[PDB]
Design an enzyme around this catalytic site. Sequence first.
Site, PDB file in Angstrom:
ATOM      1  N   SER A  30       7.151 -12.802  -2.101  1.00  0.00           N
ATOM      2  CA  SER A  30       6.162 -13.489  -1.224  1.00  0.00           C
ATOM      3  C   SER A  30       6.617 -14.938  -1.118  1.00  0.00           C
ATOM      4  O   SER A  30       7.466 -15.411  -1.966  1.00  0.00           O
ATOM      5  CB  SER A  30       4.773 -13.516  -1.923  1.00  0.00           C
ATOM      6  OG  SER A  30       3.897 -14.340  -1.177  1.00  0.00           O
ATOM      7  N   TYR A  63      -1.021 -13.661  -9.190  1.00  0.00           N
ATOM      8  CA  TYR A  63      -0.125 -13.217  -8.166  1.00  0.00           C
ATOM      9  C   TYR A  63       1.125 -14.163  -8.029  1.00  0.00           C
ATOM     10  O   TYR A  63       2.252 -13.649  -7.911  1.00  0.00           O
ATOM     11  CB  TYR A  63      -0.931 -13.210  -6.855  1.00  0.00           C
ATOM     12  CG  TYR A  63      -0.155 -12.678  -5.637  1.00  0.00           C
ATOM     13  CD1 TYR A  63       0.554 -13.534  -4.794  1.00  0.00           C
ATOM     14  CD2 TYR A  63      -0.188 -11.312  -5.329  1.00  0.00           C
ATOM     15  CE1 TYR A  63       1.245 -12.975  -3.673  1.00  0.00           C
ATOM     16  CE2 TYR A  63       0.394 -10.767  -4.221  1.00  0.00           C
ATOM     17  CZ  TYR A  63       1.100 -11.610  -3.404  1.00  0.00           C
ATOM     18  OH  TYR A  63       1.767 -11.080  -2.336  1.00  0.00           O
TER      19      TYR A  63
HETATM   20  N1  LIG Z   1       0.296  -9.099   3.532  1.00  0.00           N
HETATM   21  C1  LIG Z   1       0.849 -10.277   3.208  1.00  0.00           C
HETATM   22  O1  LIG Z   1       0.549 -11.361   3.819  1.00  0.00           O
HETATM   23  C2  LIG Z   1       1.869 -10.333   2.152  1.00  0.00           C
HETATM   24  C3  LIG Z   1       2.577 -11.541   2.041  1.00  0.00           C
HETATM   25  C4  LIG Z   1       3.605 -11.646   1.031  1.00  0.00           C
HETATM   26  C5  LIG Z   1       3.919 -10.561   0.186  1.00  0.00           C
HETATM   27  N2  LIG Z   1       3.130  -9.410   0.336  1.00  0.00           N
HETATM   28  C6  LIG Z   1       3.458  -8.264  -0.519  1.00  0.00           C
HETATM   29  O2  LIG Z   1       3.815  -7.183   0.334  1.00  0.00           O
HETATM   30  C7  LIG Z   1       3.582  -5.974  -0.483  1.00  0.00           C
HETATM   31  C8  LIG Z   1       2.804  -4.953   0.296  1.00  0.00           C
HETATM   32  O3  LIG Z   1       1.502  -5.538   0.562  1.00  0.00           O
HETATM   33  P1  LIG Z   1       0.642  -5.252   1.874  1.00  0.00           P
HETATM   34  O4  LIG Z   1       0.161  -6.524   2.410  1.00  0.00           O
HETATM   35  O5  LIG Z   1       1.378  -4.339   2.718  1.00  0.00           O
HETATM   36  O6  LIG Z   1      -0.629  -4.557   1.214  1.00  0.00           O
HETATM   37  P2  LIG Z   1      -1.412  -3.176   1.443  1.00  0.00           P
HETATM   38  O7  LIG Z   1      -2.601  -3.318   0.643  1.00  0.00           O
HETATM   39  O8  LIG Z   1      -1.682  -2.949   2.869  1.00  0.00           O
HETATM   40  O9  LIG Z   1      -0.477  -2.053   0.818  1.00  0.00           O
HETATM   41  C9  LIG Z   1      -0.336  -1.948  -0.639  1.00  0.00           C
HETATM   42  C10 LIG Z   1       0.427  -0.632  -0.802  1.00  0.00           C
HETATM   43  O10 LIG Z   1       0.576  -0.512  -2.267  1.00  0.00           O
HETATM   44  C11 LIG Z   1      -0.097   0.691  -2.753  1.00  0.00           C
HETATM   45  N3  LIG Z   1      -0.503   0.566  -4.110  1.00  0.00           N
HETATM   46  C12 LIG Z   1      -1.554  -0.235  -4.587  1.00  0.00           C
HETATM   47  N4  LIG Z   1      -1.710  -0.075  -5.902  1.00  0.00           N
HETATM   48  C13 LIG Z   1      -0.713   0.816  -6.304  1.00  0.00           C
HETATM   49  C14 LIG Z   1      -0.353   1.406  -7.524  1.00  0.00           C
HETATM   50  N5  LIG Z   1      -0.990   1.074  -8.706  1.00  0.00           N
HETATM   51  N6  LIG Z   1       0.707   2.264  -7.494  1.00  0.00           N
HETATM   52  C15 LIG Z   1       1.323   2.620  -6.377  1.00  0.00           C
HETATM   53  N7  LIG Z   1       1.030   2.125  -5.148  1.00  0.00           N
HETATM   54  C16 LIG Z   1       0.034   1.204  -5.191  1.00  0.00           C
HETATM   55  C17 LIG Z   1      -1.211   0.873  -1.745  1.00  0.00           C
HETATM   56  O11 LIG Z   1      -1.716   2.239  -1.802  1.00  0.00           O
HETATM   57  C18 LIG Z   1      -0.484   0.561  -0.435  1.00  0.00           C
HETATM   58  O12 LIG Z   1       0.358   1.645  -0.064  1.00  0.00           O
HETATM   59  C19 LIG Z   1       2.878  -6.383  -1.783  1.00  0.00           C
HETATM   60  O13 LIG Z   1       3.899  -6.519  -2.842  1.00  0.00           O
HETATM   61  C20 LIG Z   1       2.356  -7.778  -1.476  1.00  0.00           C
HETATM   62  O14 LIG Z   1       2.276  -8.575  -2.648  1.00  0.00           O
HETATM   63  C21 LIG Z   1       2.167  -9.273   1.328  1.00  0.00           C
HETATM   64  C1  LIG Z   2       0.328 -14.790   1.734  1.00  0.00           C
HETATM   65  C2  LIG Z   2      -0.326 -13.624   0.905  1.00  0.00           C
HETATM   66  C3  LIG Z   2       0.672 -13.130  -0.084  1.00  0.00           C
HETATM   67  O1  LIG Z   2       1.450 -13.906  -0.712  1.00  0.00           O
HETATM   68  O2  LIG Z   2       0.624 -11.912  -0.351  1.00  0.00           O
HETATM   69  C4  LIG Z   2      -1.415 -14.108   0.005  1.00  0.00           C
HETATM   70  O3  LIG Z   2      -1.383 -15.262  -0.423  1.00  0.00           O
HETATM   71  O4  LIG Z   2      -2.359 -13.329  -0.312  1.00  0.00           O
END
Ligand SMILES: NC(=O)c1ccc[n+]([C@@H]2O[C@H](COP(=O)([O-])OP(=O)(O)OC[C@H]3O[C@@H](n4cnc5c(N)ncnc54)[C@H](O)[C@@H]3O)[C@@H](O)[C@H]2O)c1
Ligand SMILES: CC(C(=O)O)C(=O)O
Lengths: 260, 260, 260, 260
Positions: B142, B155
């Site tokens: 992230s 996080y």
């Molecule tokens: N959305 C954002 O702005 C953002 C930004 C930076 C990084 N991220 C990262 O991107 C990644 C995906 O996040 P997202 O935004 O797509 O979220 P999301 O909530 O839409 O998807 C999360 C996925 O992880 C699964 N999951 C949750 N707990 C689990 C477990 N214990 N075991 C197995 N699977 C599990 C969920 O079922 C889902 O498939 C994460 O690592 C998050 O930290 C997201």
């Molecule tokens: C930007 C988003 C992430 O890092 O997953 C958050 O801060 O929740």
Amino acid sequence: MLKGKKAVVTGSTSGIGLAMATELAKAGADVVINGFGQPEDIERERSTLESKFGVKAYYLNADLSDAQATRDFIAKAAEALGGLDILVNNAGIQHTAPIEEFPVDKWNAIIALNLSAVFHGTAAALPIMQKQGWGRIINIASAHGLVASVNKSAYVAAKHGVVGLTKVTALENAGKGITCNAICPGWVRTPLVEKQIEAISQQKGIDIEAAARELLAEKQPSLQFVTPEQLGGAAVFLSSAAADQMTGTTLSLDGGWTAR
Amino acid sequence: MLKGKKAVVTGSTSGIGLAMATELAKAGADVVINGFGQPEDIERERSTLESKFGVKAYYLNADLSDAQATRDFIAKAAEALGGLDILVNNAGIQHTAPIEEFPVDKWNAIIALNLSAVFHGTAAALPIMQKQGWGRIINIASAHGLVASVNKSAYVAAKHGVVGLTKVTALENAGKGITCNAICPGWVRTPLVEKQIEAISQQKGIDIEAAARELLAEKQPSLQFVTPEQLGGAAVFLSSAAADQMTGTTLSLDGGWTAR
Amino acid sequence: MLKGKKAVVTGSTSGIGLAMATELAKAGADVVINGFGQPEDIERERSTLESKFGVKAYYLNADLSDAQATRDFIAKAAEALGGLDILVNNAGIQHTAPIEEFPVDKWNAIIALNLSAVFHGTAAALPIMQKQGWGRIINIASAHGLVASVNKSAYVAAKHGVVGLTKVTALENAGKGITCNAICPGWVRTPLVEKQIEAISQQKGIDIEAAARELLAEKQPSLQFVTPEQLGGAAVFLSSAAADQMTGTTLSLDGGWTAR
Amino acid sequence: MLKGKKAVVTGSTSGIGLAMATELAKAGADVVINGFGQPEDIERERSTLESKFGVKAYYLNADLSDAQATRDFIAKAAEALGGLDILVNNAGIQHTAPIEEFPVDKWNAIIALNLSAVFHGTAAALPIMQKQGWGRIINIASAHGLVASVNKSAYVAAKHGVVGLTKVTALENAGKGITCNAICPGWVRTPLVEKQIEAISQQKGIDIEAAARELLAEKQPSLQFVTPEQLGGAAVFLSSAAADQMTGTTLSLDGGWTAR
Ligand SMILES: NC(=O)c1ccc[n+]([C@@H]2O[C@H](COP(=O)([O-])OP(=O)(O)OC[C@H]3O[C@@H](n4cnc5c(N)ncnc54)[C@H](O)[C@@H]3O)[C@@H](O)[C@H]2O)c1
Ligand SMILES: CC(C(=O)O)C(=O)O
Ligand SMILES: NC(=O)c1ccc[n+]([C@@H]2O[C@H](COP(=O)([O-])OP(=O)(O)OC[C@H]3O[C@@H](n4cnc5c(N)ncnc54)[C@H](O)[C@@H]3O)[C@@H](O)[C@H]2O)c1
Ligand SMILES: NC(=O)c1ccc[n+]([C@@H]2O[C@H](COP(=O)([O-])OP(=O)(O)OC[C@H]3O[C@@H](n4cnc5c(N)ncnc54)[C@H](O)[C@@H]3O)[C@@H](O)[C@H]2O)c1
Ligand SMILES: NC(=O)c1ccc[n+]([C@@H]2O[C@H](COP(=O)([O-])OP(=O)(O)OC[C@H]3O[C@@H](n4cnc5c(N)ncnc54)[C@H](O)[C@@H]3O)[C@@H](O)[C@H]2O)c1
Ligand SMILES: CC(C(=O)O)C(=O)O
Ligand SMILES: CC(C(=O)O)C(=O)O
Ligand SMILES: CC(C(=O)O)C(=O)O
Ligand SMILES: [Cl-]
Ligand SMILES: [Cl-]
Ligand SMILES: [Cl-]
Ligand SMILES: [Cl-]
Ligand code: NA
Ligand code: NA
Ligand code: NA
Ligand code: NA
Ligand code: NA
Ligand code: NA
Ligand code: NA
Ligand code: NA
Ligand code: NA
Ligand code: NA
């Protein structure tokens, strides 16, 4: 594909920039090339970009250590191409000596080309990109824009400066359809590195290839050179829609140099 | 193209991971998907990867907060696929509170999934990649692996940890044909973010879309969300030969967040 | 205490550098001061360093945008002091405009003072420090040596360059008794910032103090200015034995700017 | 001087933490010490802090790998001291192996102590610091919170996590009179390093001192160890008023490790 894009690559008569220009042309962009070398080689480069890849290519000679000549280069490039969508600020030089022995004219020449030309070229390109609502500025920095080595004061300072300048460019143009990013290579076996390999081989009394191996072992954990072709692929990715929200950052292709 | 590659995407039933799995399948890879959700939706996801893109797809349910279950997941995934070439460690969760109010069980749950599962999954995959002399480990960190925000202690700590772990993985496997890199997104409008948008909209007494705009303005200079599709393109680039010497680094798609 | 040390502070007639010179003199160092301003004020500064703190102080006028004049300044400073143990490269200027409007002469003036003078001053000081086996070079960079803001292309590029140059200096002189580090301040209310506060107050139609508050809120999470006195304490710490193995790094006093 | 301050140092029965506690006591702070070792040695440490430096000192045994025991430690420490002004989160361990061979219980033990204890200790201390409007949280990270080395996955991940956590802590408490910073040492010759020196000496068939020299040459350009005493001086500086606007940052004492 970058079909119909219009690209400019500084310092594209050798090395990484030549591969930049080739890959962009292979993706379908028309290309302005630039740099020094033998005229017969430069015209064969130009004409073969067109005959191999079916694009238009133009060679514009400009010494980009001169500010005005850099700004005039960009205008001439844009006139040639009928626009300017992708600018690759690549031309650069190296010189190695400890600080107290480092020639004042080599400091000035590395800051002028490796840093100030990126500023002047960007300034001249920006209004063209702003009016059309799309652009890519791809600056070729170095692992030495993020970390240092001995005997490279001017170059490390210039490349750090290019990383800073890339961030400003991106912030000023955020959301306008324009991104600005810095590709930061580790060692790539071009003439800029071959000179250092030879200097090592003499210092150590070893052959050229054992010297290349020692060069890599000191800095680059993969023990393999980054290739110009790989770098041209990175620029083609930066030019893609997947990279529309990639802006103000560095893309390190360095075999692990900056992980340690 | 990644024709014939074998890919695993954790947390690919929603959000970014679902787009990871889609783009990899569209490039020709067979895919293991994983995560929670409604069974009918998960099976339609699986079967449509196959029917749209002509690859094989498998769903393996594992709660990756359990170390053994993560290591057993990787073995089951590799058995399903007949190998394992690309591992995307993507699953993660978020929880926001100031440190002194931050629940000890939410700290433990974010460290277990967002950090330790990346370690256990990597450990189980590595010997398969080492024996074949090729691999990609793509960790989804992230912007919060490089900088911090308030109320996100677990996080930010976990994601910084993933950036460190990515560097180790890459150094240990440098030159073996295996790379390890961290994609570091800014805001992406998935359910993980929608919850924060809603919490903002209530805090501020405004509609959901004005809340999304304020979310973006605070952190992301482009004022546009990064898309899951863009992120899946970045993973397809990391999987390409152009990225053979890209290892141990971060690839920031964050609309300028970390440039300022 | 730095009793008997010999210190040079560039741009010490105002602002941070004046506090640098004061704190070093209060620790017992003899001091060379430098910079522009009203002659009566400069001589009162010089003489009061001596009469308050019981050290020797010298004012040497040099425009450090000239390379030769910077190298000649260092020689004259060393002759005055009878040596040179601590060099504070502090003098710098700011100018704000978007890149395409940024004056070419202001780019050249900010690179010359804010970057090249640090190189020329370091080059001239180093042999004196190398022969005695002890030294401190303390470069005043900025948060803008690590991150960017809009409308500050030359300054962000120069300050990133100073961070790179600091790293080279330190590596070339590692283990010699010489350290080189960069102090990276956030906002400090000196004339360089007051101009920006006033420009804001006019842009926004608000008083000067509400403008200072908005300046701080945009960048500096503590909502308090860093003080010149705090900065002079940081330089006194860098000059201490506890900092003998602190080299090639940045010391950020920025109220949390670069943590987010 | 830190006369009348109340300090807590985790893992202060050896190594860096012992020097932390000594320097803080020498500055006038009352001190809680903590960690494992021989009871006679621990009581002599406690009593000599008092008899040499004229402060009060208390030893509280807590295994900080347990969350509750860390939170209960902080409460007991605060009761002993009559407050809590400076918290040094120092206790930590190391284990070296490649990822696929790295014991799951050693990953869990390094994350629990080296990362989670910093979170639990911070959470328990914060409300005491917030109510009084002054505080210092000084986390001992490592160069390995900023870069990686092979065979140190858990430790590099944990230390990167501590750098992230330090930034959050600082942002959440910005302007409250509380700062949070991470000291990031290079090699310091304590038992944690002596074990690695011995492992090297056996791997290479060389004596212990030639092994220490090779350890330093690989990572630390000064070719000299950082000392615990230097580190305790850095913590005394972080505790000073000059550091009131130093928050959310890293202070690297690493002989140039992270400059290259
Ligand atoms: N959305 C954002 O702005 C953002 C930004 C930076 C990084 N991220 C990262 O991107 C990644 C995906 O996040 P997202 O935004 O797509 O979220 P999301 O909530 O839409 O998807 C999360 C996925 O992880 C699964 N999951 C949750 N707990 C689990 C477990 N214990 N075991 C197995 N699977 C599990 C969920 O079922 C889902 O498939 C994460 O690592 C998050 O930290 C997201
Ligand atoms: C930007 C988003 C992430 O890092 O997953 C958050 O801060 O929740
Ligand atoms: N080779 C490496 O290992 C390496 C690593 C990191 C970054 N870089 C950077 O990659 C870029 C290209 O370097 P390269 O290795 O391909 O070197 P190269 O020497 O092979 O090519 C330099 C190109 O710049 C041109 N050029 C030189 N001076 C110029 C001037 N005043 N005006 C216009 N053109 C000029 C040359 O004619 C040539 O076309 C440079 O910015 C360099 O700093 C190279
Ligand atoms: N004030 C801030 O918020 C801030 C923040 C980060 C870094 N900095 C840096 O701190 C340093 C000092 O800045 P300040 O805020 O105290 O500014 P200031 O304007 O108050 O002082 C600048 C000093 O430099 C001198 N100077 C200017 N041009 C010179 C020249 N050509 N040759 C010699 N001396 C020259 C001036 O006479 C003056 O003594 C600069 O390097 C600046 O970039 C300031
Ligand atoms: N020595 C180095 O080169 C070096 C470099 C960078 C960072 N560090 C860090 O400095 C810190 C101190 O390390 P050191 O080198 O002084 O090591 P050390 O082994 O000499 O001291 C470790 C201290 O932590 C205590 N401790 C261990 N387990 C504990 C537990 N479960 N609960 C409470 N106390 C516990 C030990 O009893 C001892 O007091 C650690 O965080 C380490 O990661 C050390
Ligand atoms: C690696 C190579 C470069 O940065 O251009 C060099 O140091 O010369
Ligand atoms: C913060 C201040 C500086 O970096 O000098 C400025 O941006 O002008
Ligand atoms: C340098 C030392 C540390 O980070 O604790 C180590 O790598 O063990
Ligand atoms: Cl080096
Ligand atoms: Cl924040
Ligand atoms: Cl900005
Ligand atoms: Cl290593
Ligand atoms: Na076009
Ligand atoms: Na130029
Ligand atoms: Na395969
Ligand atoms: Na886990
Ligand atoms: Na930032
Ligand atoms: Na002296
Ligand atoms: Na100059
Ligand atoms: Na007190
Ligand atoms: Na714990
Ligand atoms: Na490094």
